Design a protein around this ligand. Structure first.
Ligand SMILES: *[C@@H]1O[C@H](CO)[C@@H](O[C@@H]2O[C@H](CO)[C@@H](O[C@@H]3O[C@H](CO[C@H]4O[C@H](CO[C@H]5O[C@H](CO)[C@@H](O)[C@H](O)[C@@H]5O[C@H]5O[C@H](CO)[C@@H](O)[C@H](O)[C@@H]5O)[C@@H](O)[C@H](O[C@H]5O[C@H](CO)[C@@H](O)[C@H](O)[C@@H]5O[C@H]5O[C@H](CO)[C@@H](O)[C@H](O)[C@@H]5O)[C@@H]4O)[C@@H](O)[C@H](O[C@H]4O[C@H](CO)[C@@H](O)[C@H](O)[C@@H]4O)[C@@H]3O)[C@H](O)[C@H]2NC(C)=O)[C@H](O)[C@H]1NC(C)=O
Ligand SMILES: C[C@H](CCC(=O)NCCNC(=O)OCc1cc(Cl)cc(Cl)c1)[C@H]1CC[C@H]2[C@@H]3[C@@H](O)C[C@@H]4C[C@H](O)CC[C@]4(C)[C@H]3CC[C@]12C
Ligand SMILES: [Ca+2]
Ligand code: NA
Ligand SMILES: [Zn+2]
Ligand SMILES: [Zn+2]
Length: 777
């Protein structure tokens, strides 16, 4: 029938009856008089001097009458223009030590002010362009930037913000995507996106509602202007106790649009940024009118940044592939390739990758099978992610052919790129005051938003506790996980004559080489701790190799060669059974597989100590192509890092992730072995390299904060990824490593290990350390 007294209901009323909620427009379900009653424009969105104390005219957009405050339907500037109040922006900064809410409020409400395409570096423009945002940032808690998820597109990131999940888990892997089981495509434009089957996880509003916390908004019909959205939130905040939501969301599509048209550094970006600020001011003036400006927690968050990208900087797949009419390409700042028709017999991923690899000197993209993408991107474990992927260089596009500028800016690139970085500000009672915090990942906010609302988060990819330092009052205290498998400490048991492995050759440990305690194994397994002069390891009897190998290299330690009488030296480990050892005959028979060592023989403390490096229990399967990467790391780079960081602690080991879910594989999940043998082949090799943040203190006597960098190098039988691999390792290996930079937390998921158990630092601080990522930007 009609929307009278029902404009912006917090309920979708039962079909077939017409709706009056904030989404009715999106479902073509509004009553005939929704536009008339609920979308009033008359006399704008701002009170004027002459309108003060007017008689209520029902048809005004917002009101300047005496009864307006009683209702909560004044314009946002009413008190400023009429009652002589100041704009929120013009008031001094003042610490909110507790929530100052009206009587009935049970929790501080949370409002999420999300902005699209908002680049981290826009905040440098400051008070001159955005005085309201600059106040929020300065007065509350802010980071220099926040890292989005890849791909750095709107919908993957927005739903990542809502769920705490990587796109591969929540299932919104792109703005555009195709699902082979559904046989349907998802797009901005279409009915398909209205089907719940695309949207996985548990967004914050569902978490809120499941636990009796009432949840507003989030998605808004695009036809509803910005000012009306702000007024509706303010109207909802004036509802009675039993009806009023404790969580709201506003979304601005700016400054993405102007970013796309004019580029990120274009002078045309100012008015759009002023427009955002104005909307923020309307919210804050509004809150201050309702006496909620020191009650509500406000998060000002972006989804990703914006880069200079013109259509003249485009790569065409038709310049590489002979039959581009046989494929479908998801184009732009990334690439996803798939067969055009499923029933094409000629289609073949191998030939396509071959044809797109290192062909032109300047080539501005790189092809990957999805499993070989840097593990830090976490973009592979979903049937909607095409097997073939193209990582496009910043500032460039990839298209299928020339007949596939109207745009000077775009985004979507690798989430470590500077231009893709975006904003975070937290303002309110629960956030800290005048506080700067380090950059962090948008996957972490869901937990924080649960904490601000007193909700138990659903399982997600944030590390709960890692952002406790953003908050005045922490409702979550993290605790270390319990160790599952106790290590064994095997003595000297077996004779050398008891081994027919086909191999030929010629105490203080713990406090020196495990600076941060023994890693805890968080699954059922059988492993041995092995002590040596120069290194300690947790040797697996199932996988026949170390789970981890830990050692410390001071700034003044020497790099010695491998003497060539020990070139093929592998020694049986007296402390481990032949039945739980590797054998060298497998390596001999396996024509594609050589081997390497986790503790480097190159950094041995003495000649006698160097022999411990050639034990069968320090040995790990390596492809000759990969041995170029690993040998350059161990020989040159680890010393380099010790010198520059005043010593370094290094924990190295294998990872098995054949089903590319970013999680530790079980035995069955291993799909490759050294031939005719039970030696499992790792998919990647990690290292965690720790030192004292204060570089003046050595690594082994650090009284302050720690400094970490890590990687997860893929274990590849070629170096096709590195187009300069024909050249010397100084030209290419370090770039390859930087691209596969990782967080310690990535390694823990992939290994089922837990590091940094014995430190003199709080566990929240350690959780922050584990989520850190060295980006090399
Ligand atoms: C990032 O964080 C993620 C979440 O913690 C991690 O992802 C999880 O990984 C685990 C381990 O592989 C996986 O577990 C499997 O689940 C199988 C059942 O799958 C269906 O149900 C689950 C659970 O339902 C609910 O719980 C989630 C939290 O995970 C919540 O977000 C949901 O809203 C839902 O909530 C409701 O229930 C809870 C619990 O009672 C209540 O608290 C709450 O109030 C709600 O009422 C769903 O998560 C699954 O979702 C997938 O599938 C749908 C439909 O296709 C997709 O739309 C969705 O996007 C998602 O798809 C992704 O995951 C699947 C695999 O699960 C991938 O194949 C796909 O490519 C996507 O990545 C399903 O609806 C279960 O059968 C299975 O059991 C087997 O293993 C166990 C041992 O573990 C054995 O005992 C058995 O023998 C089985 O062999 C297994 O338990 C989770 O499903 C998955 N969760 C999510 C959300 O992704 C991720 O690993 C982590 N990443 C990193 C790098 O750390
Ligand atoms: C996709 C479509 C909305 C169209 C659009 O572009 N709207 C822009 C405004 N967006 C907005 O305000 O979002 C705020 C926001 C902020 C943050 Cl930080 C994070 C997020 Cl995720 C969002 C909408 C309209 C209706 C939506 C469906 C809904 O009606 C029913 C389901 C609800 C469920 O929780 C998810 C799946 C749905 C099918 C919704 C999918 C998206 C729809 C179609
Ligand atoms: Ca796995
Ligand atoms: Na070999
Ligand atoms: Zn966006
Ligand atoms: Zn955009």
């Amino acid at each position: 029938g009609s929307c009278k007294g029902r404009c912006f209901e917090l309920q979708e009323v039962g079909p077939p009856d017409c709706r009056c909620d904030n989404l009715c427009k999106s479902y073509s379900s509004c009553c005939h008089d929704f536009d008339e009653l609920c979308l009033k424009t008359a006399r704008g969105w701002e009170c004027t001097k002459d309108r003060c104390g007017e008689v209520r005219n029902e048809e005004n957009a917002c009101h300047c009458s005496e009864d307006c405050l009683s209702r909560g339907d004044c314009c946002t500037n009413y008190q400023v223009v009429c009652k002589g109040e100041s704009h929120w922006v013009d008031d001094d900064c003042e610490e909110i030590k507790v929530p100052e809410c009206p009587a009935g409020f049970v929790r501080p409400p949370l409002i999420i002010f999300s902005v699209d395409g908002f680049r981290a570096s826009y905040m440098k423009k400051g008070s001159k362009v955005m005085p309201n945002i600059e106040k929020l940032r300065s007065c509350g808690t802010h980071a220099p930037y926040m890292r989005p998820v890849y791909p750095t597109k709107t919908f993957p990131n927005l739903y990542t913000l809502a769920t705490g999940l990587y796109p591969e888990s929540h299932g919104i892997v792109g703005n555009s995507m195709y699902d082979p089981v559904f046989d349907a495509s998802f797009h901005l434009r279409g009915r398909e996106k209205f089907n719940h089957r695309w949207w996985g996880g548990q967004p914050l509003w569902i978490t809120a509602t499941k636990q009796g916390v009432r949840a507003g908004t989030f998605f808004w019909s695009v036809s509803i202007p910005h000012e009306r959205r702000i007024l509706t939130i303010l109207q909802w905040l004036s509802l009675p106790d039993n009806e009023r939501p404790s969580v709201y969301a506003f979304y601005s599509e700016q400054p993405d649009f102007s970013g796309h048209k004019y580029g990120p550094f274009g002078p045309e970006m100012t008015n759009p940024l002023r427009e955002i600020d104005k909307t923020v001011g309307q919210l804050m003036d509004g809150l201050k009118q309702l006496r909620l400006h020191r009650c509500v927690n406000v998060i000002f968050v972006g989804d990703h940044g914006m880069e200079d990208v013109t259509c003249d900087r485009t790569e065409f797949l038709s310049n590489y592939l002979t039959n581009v009419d046989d494929i479908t390409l998801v184009p732009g700042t990334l690439g996803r390739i798939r067969a055009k028709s499923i029933n094409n017999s000629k289609y073949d991923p191998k030939t396509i990758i071959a044809a797109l690899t290192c062909k032109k000197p300047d080539q501005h993209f790189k092809p990957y099978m999805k499993q070989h993408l840097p593990k830090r991107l976490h973009y592979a474990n979903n049937r909607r992610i095409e097997d073939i992927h193209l990582l496009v260089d910043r500032r460039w596009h990839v298209a299928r052919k020339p007949l596939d500028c109207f745009f000077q800016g775009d985004h979507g690139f690798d989430n470590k790129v500077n231009s893709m970085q975006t904003v975070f500000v937290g303002y309110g009672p629960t956030f800290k005051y005048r506080t700067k915090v380090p950059p962090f990942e948008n996957i972490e906010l869901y937990n924080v938003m649960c904490d601000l609302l007193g909700l138990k988060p659903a399982p997600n990819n944030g590390t709960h506790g890692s952002l406790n330092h953003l908050l005045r009052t922490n409702t979550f205290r993290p605790t270390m996980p319990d160790e599952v498998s106790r290590p064994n400490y095997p003595g000297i048991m077996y004779l050398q004559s008891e081994f027919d492995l086909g191999c030929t050759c010629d105490g203080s440990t713990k406090e020196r080489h495990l600076l941060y305690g023994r890693p805890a194994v968080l699954y059922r397994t059988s492993y041995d701790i092995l002590y040596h002069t120069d290194f300690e390891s947790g040797y697996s009897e199932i996988f026949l190799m170390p789970l981890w190998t830990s050692y410390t290299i001071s700034k003044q330690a020497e790099v010695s060669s491998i003497p060539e009488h020990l070139t093929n030296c592998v020694r049986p480990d007296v402390r481990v059974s032949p039945g739980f050892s590797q054998n060298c005959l497998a390596y001999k028979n396996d024509k594609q597989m050589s081997y390497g060592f986790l503790f480097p023989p190159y950094l041995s403390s003495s000649p006698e100590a160097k022999y411990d490096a050639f034990l069968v229990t320090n040995m790990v399967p390596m492809y000759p192509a990969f041995k170029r990467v690993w040998a350059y790391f161990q020989r040159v780079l680890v010393k380099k890092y010790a010198s520059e960081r005043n010593g370094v602690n290094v924990i190295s080991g294998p990872i098995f992730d054949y089903n590319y879910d970013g999680l530790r594989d079980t035995e069955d999940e291993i799909k490759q072995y050294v031939e005719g043998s039970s030696i499992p082949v790792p998919t990647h090799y990690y290292s965690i390299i720790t030192s004292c943040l204060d570089f003046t203190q050595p690594a082994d006597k650090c009284d302050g904060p720690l400094s970490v960098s890590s990687f997860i190098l893929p274990h590849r039988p070629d170096n096709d990824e590195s187009c300069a691999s024909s050249e010397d390792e100084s030209k290419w290996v370090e770039e390859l490593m930087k691209m596969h930079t990782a967080r310690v937390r990535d390694i823990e998921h992939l290994t089922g290990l837990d590091f940094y158990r014995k430190t003199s630092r709080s566990y929240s601080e350690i959780l922050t350390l584990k989520t850190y990522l060295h980006t090399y930007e």
